Design goal:
Four copies of one chain form a homotetramer.
Chain A lengths: L1 H10 L2 H20 L7 H27 L2 H5 L3 H12 L11 H5 L1 H13 L4 H22 L4 H4 L2 H12 L4 H12 L4 H39 L6 H19 L1
Helix pairs in contact in A: 1-3, 2-3, 3-5, 7-12, 8-10, 8-12
The complex binds hega-10 (2CV) (4 copies).
PDB class: membrane protein
Keywords: Volatge-Gated Sodium Channel, membrane protein
Assembly: tetrameric
């Protein structure tokens, strides 16, 4: 009650954030050392104890939190939920995903991720268009080339894999298209438009994400620092037409 | 008449759009399953029936439309025409192109495509410049390298293919230019400027398309939601000089 | 005199521009057909006559021009000069460069090229920085790797070639850096920073050219259509502070 | 005193800058000629003398400077310090780094570098996010693939190297992922998301650096030319609301 409020003053301090950070890093360094196959059984045992400890400190932390905010208002944050699952799941195979908590706990990092997630809706149609082009290209490539080139095109899955490699431009010619053209001389009529269209569309997708993500993140950094953001130049002129219509009705 | 108007209320509903969408997807899923060579004759027969059905539902749809708008005002839309050809052509070899109708029927997808098409005119000159550079490079590479490297440069078509691969940077050095230089030591004087100029110009082309397409699509999304778009800051200041010249002539 | 002025009305017409264009294309198509080694001697002889003709029409054109403007005011245009050299040089080895005249004669194409040239000064320092990084990297790579990898690094020229290939990311790892690391295990400490720095800087160079070129070309298209361009929003507000300081000194 | 002030008039002249530049270039040309292994002992001896001379002229220069500004106000500039270390270090293995002084001495070049350095803080979080993704990916790839593919993934360092190559898209499929999938058929589920996420994030990182660096450098070029820069449109409208609130309180 006064307890509830004094704990939150802990939870929300600089020093406590620094301590959870330091433990994420330590847990991460330890999962890193464990990839090393040459370790003694004792070394591995130790490292596995440091990990147990790290996981334990996280349970407390989360408890401190589920308490000092209650079940309703902890689980009202996606980051709390994510922190929750991440930690809880470890009480039941890629443990190293725990290092993602550097993102949930460091606010400037969290704001980068939020900008990117929030940008995803407005490129949904560019992405769907890419999806449709892939699907169509993969069906045609399977029918065209599957019998003569089955490792690359022998079924839909193979085709999609190969076309993704082709869109990334990786050995698309020496490794895929020239060998195809030795058997199907006009295959460039398929592959060259595929490349032009997917590279255009994937860059549209990337640029749209990045331009929006950056604008979102920047507003969030403003709000977090000062409680508000910059009004769009649009509003500034909208509102400049409220105070000019009034200065003209005054001026009569 | 009241019929004409009640059908359009169908045609233009949310639910009917959802139903045509669902049938495109189904037709697409089925052309996908058909790429699989291992299918029984019965399985193939069935799938081919589902496709026949899908095509049939599309004929009705289009009929519902050519009617409820008349021959003049259906064929006044490029999307209707495209839908028309796409569907009609199937009554006479890449059927999977029918999945492009996800674009013509879903409005946010249609607006992405429209932005891109509408951006094409204003990069026409950058594209023509790329075309001219290719043509010249391919003539020179044929004359320079065609006799000693005929698989890559033996004729104009070969040269253009190879240069396109070179502009995409795919094995341009280990696979093409170093082998060329073993016979023609100064060939880097050709290939390195080619790469610098085409990569600059193709990126100019891509960026111009994308920046314009995005601005067009965004206005179209505004118009579609609210019947108008944002006036350019330019007009907002143009018009701010109409109301400032009048507030100064009032103020005398 | 009235002749001078009536010729210019030819020179500057739409139809005459279309005719010079058509001849450039024809000359280009013919230099293209000549790359084909299989041609009869008669075919080659003919084609070579069409080229002679094309060159001749260009001499007239230029004459019509050097006349109707005089030696001083023809050679006052870089495009006229370029047209001049291009054509004159053919009266004394890459003839196909004549197709560059599509650029000098078509105004929208000329404006693309002008934007790019005019953008070059303002990226001069980014380019010089790239140059310095290359030079330093190539000296170090020669000293580090020249004795053990002389085909790639054996002298300064080899090094620069290889590093250019490395900056384009072409086989930089499977083909160059992994083989280097088998002999020099820490070579990634050289190559990975090289890549990060040159890819950052070359993209800075590209983006700077393109952003400026596009703004320049767009002003030139405005001027060419209407005799003026859009004032920068800056001037529009500068000038909005001239008419607001006067409306406040009026308002006293 | 009047000496102090007359020397600075040297130090800060155009001609003296041109002379230090010319000596950097000469020192650089000479370290370049020295990479050549075929040189006589006399040639090498000479070149090594030209370098000794170059280094000597630099000691004077720096002395002229440490004097005419004093120990406090020379070492108050990062460029002076950099110049200082660079030159002093040569009095005790990559000498060619001395050519970096073209950057410290030429002001437009220095302003390019400053924009880039100054842009680094505001992408710190995007970079940290890339770092975290790498670290996690490398731990997982080591555990997943290290035993079956130890040259690429056998330990954390190997994994990071390979993943960096994969993010650059260099042979990522023909050279790494297809061979991995022959043993681990679902490995595309790891590698394809890795590529999508790192290419998105590294481009975010690059674009953020470049957009900021260019805006910073451009303000610095303004300040250096005229003692001030352009006020942000924001301030121009902020301040346009100071003079509109006063013109409305006047107008009462
Ligand atoms: C932008 C959309 C990108 C979509 C890419 C998805 C590809 C799916 C790949 C897949 O399902 N495979 C089969 C897994 O069973 C991979 C095959 O390529 C494999 O058979 C090879 O080893 C030959
Ligand atoms: C940006 C412009 C890109 C234009 C690219 C067009 C390339 C046309 C390719 C072509 O016509 N070929 C011949 C088809 O007959 C391909 C040859 O490369 C082929 O002979 C090979 O198998 C050797
Ligand atoms: C951004 C700056 C890009 C500058 C790139 C310039 C490279 C100059 C290449 C050169 O002069 N060579 C020697 C020509 O004599 C090429 C060698 O690589 C050659 O010896 C090979 O066949 C082995
Ligand atoms: C964006 C982050 C990019 C980070 C990349 C760092 C890579 C570190 C590479 C390294 O430390 N190696 C071992 C050096 O001891 C390289 C190995 O790949 C080597 O063993 C090979 O020859 C097999």
């Amino acid at each position: 009650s006064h307890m509830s409020r004094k704990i939150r003053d802990l939870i929300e301090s600089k020093r406590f954030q620094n301590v959870i950070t330091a433990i994420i890093v330590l847990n991460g360094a330890v999962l890193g050392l464990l990839t090393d196959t040459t370790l003694s059984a004792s070394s591995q045992n130790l490292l596995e104890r440091v990990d147990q400890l790290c996981l334990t400190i996280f349970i407390v932390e989360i408890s401190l939190k589920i308490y000092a905010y209650g079940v309703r208002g902890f689980f009202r944050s996606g980051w709390n939920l994510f922190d929750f699952v991440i930690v809880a799941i470890a009480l039941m195979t890629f443990r190293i995903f725990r290092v993602m908590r550097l993102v949930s706990v460091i606010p400037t990092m969290r704001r980068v991720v939020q900008g990117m997630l929030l940008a995803l809706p407005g490129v949904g149609s560019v992405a769907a268009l890419l999806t449709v082009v892939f699907y169509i290209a993969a069906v045609m490539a399977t029918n065209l080339y599957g019998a003569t080139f089955p490792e690359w095109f022998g079924d839909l899955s193979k085709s999609l894999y190969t076309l993704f490699q082709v869109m990334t431009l990786e050995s698309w010619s020496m490794g895929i298209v020239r060998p195809v053209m030795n058997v199907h001389p006009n295959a460039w009529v398929f592959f060259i438009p595929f490349i032009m269209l997917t590279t255009l569309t994937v860059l549209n997708l990337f640029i749209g994400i990045i331009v929006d993500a950056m604008a979102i993140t920047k507003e969030q950094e403003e709000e977090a620092k000062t409680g508000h953001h910059q009004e769009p130049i649009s509003q500034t002129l909208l509102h400049l037409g409220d105070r000019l219509d009034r200065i003209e009705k005054q001026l009569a």
